[PDB]
Amino acid sequence: SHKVTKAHNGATLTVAVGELVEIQLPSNPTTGFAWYFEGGTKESPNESMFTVENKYFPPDSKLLGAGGTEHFHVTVKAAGTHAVNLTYMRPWTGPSHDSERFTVYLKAN
């Protein structure tokens, strides 16, 4: 779709102020790792620039340890280029060996 996935890591998306941007990333939160902004939160680092809602979708599977998908539904609040910088990590630990990074830039005119 216009869903942003791992394949778009590092990409710049041109967006309208007020447009919901759909980000979907593989996530396995029962490993204790999930996707966070710096500091270990799901919340926008600057609510003035963009707003973020987050939802985790488990696989419809009974396998213990089967990963699902985290959605971040991101709304741009202001004109500018805004970096959405996520890290896959244990939020009580911060970055570790297995951590990964995902960035998208949202350019709003």
């Binding site: 599977s61 213990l64 340890g65 089967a66 630990t93 297995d98």
Partner: protein, 212 residues
């Protein structure tokens, strides 16, 4: 049965492990029970190989998920090697059991606890550590730092851990997320709520190795 049980106090529980980002909780959960029952029967506490279960259980999917009962079934059928013999790599590789000489231990079978029954689970924990499942994806479970946990969390289980004890109002659970999580790696989940699923679905599906 006792008012309190804590297998760590009997030397039957090895240190807390870290599964990494691999979806291997099913294998970690199983191994806690095996380590526990071997101490109970033999008097020795050894570490056994999560990696072997990851690589060798053809019914499970490596870091893509699995079943603690399936790992126990494998150990009953074929046995398991020591951790130092077959160390954790946190990614699935080829099954290397045959290159590792004879298995270190083998169990005699796998048994399920009567499900959705708190008393049945406590009786089993009083005998030995038990593999249990719960709903652990929630933020509050992720951010758990200690105390008796009553939620919030759902009832659709997604994580396998091991119950290694209990008290009047909790069941003591060894997690596989390192010692920086919860109570040095442990969580006490509230019991006695009257909810048959248990808190976070804790009574959904519980298994233990049979070993004479």
């Amino acid at each position: 049965i006792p008012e309190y049980v804590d297998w760590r106090q009997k030397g039957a529980v090895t240190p807390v492990k870290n599964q990494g980002s691999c979806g291997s909780c099913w294998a970690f959960s199983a191994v806690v029970t095996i380590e526990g029952i071997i101490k109970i029967r033999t008097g020795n506490l050894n570490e056994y190989s999560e990696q072997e279960l990851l690589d060798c259980d053809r019914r499970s999917y490596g870091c893509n998920g699995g079943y603690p009962w399936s790992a126990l079934q494998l150990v009953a059928q074929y046995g398991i090697h020591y951790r130092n013999t077959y160390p954790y790599e946190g990614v699935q590789r080829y099954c290397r059991s045959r290159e590792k000489g004879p298995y270190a231990a083998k169990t005699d079978g796998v048994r399920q606890v009567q499900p959705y029954n708190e008393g049945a689970l406590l009786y089993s924990i009083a005998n030995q550590p038990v593999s249990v499942v719960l709903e652990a994806a929630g933020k509050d479970f992720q951010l758990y730092r200690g105390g008796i946990f009553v939620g919030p969390c759902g009832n659709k289980v997604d994580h396998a851990v091991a119950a290694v004890g209990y008290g009047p109002n909790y069941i003591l659970i060894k997690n596989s997320w390192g010692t920086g999580w919860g109570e040095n790696g442990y969580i006490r989940i509230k019991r006695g709520t009257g909810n048959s699923y248990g808190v976070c679905g804790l009574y959904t599906s519980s298994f233990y190795p049979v070993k004479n």
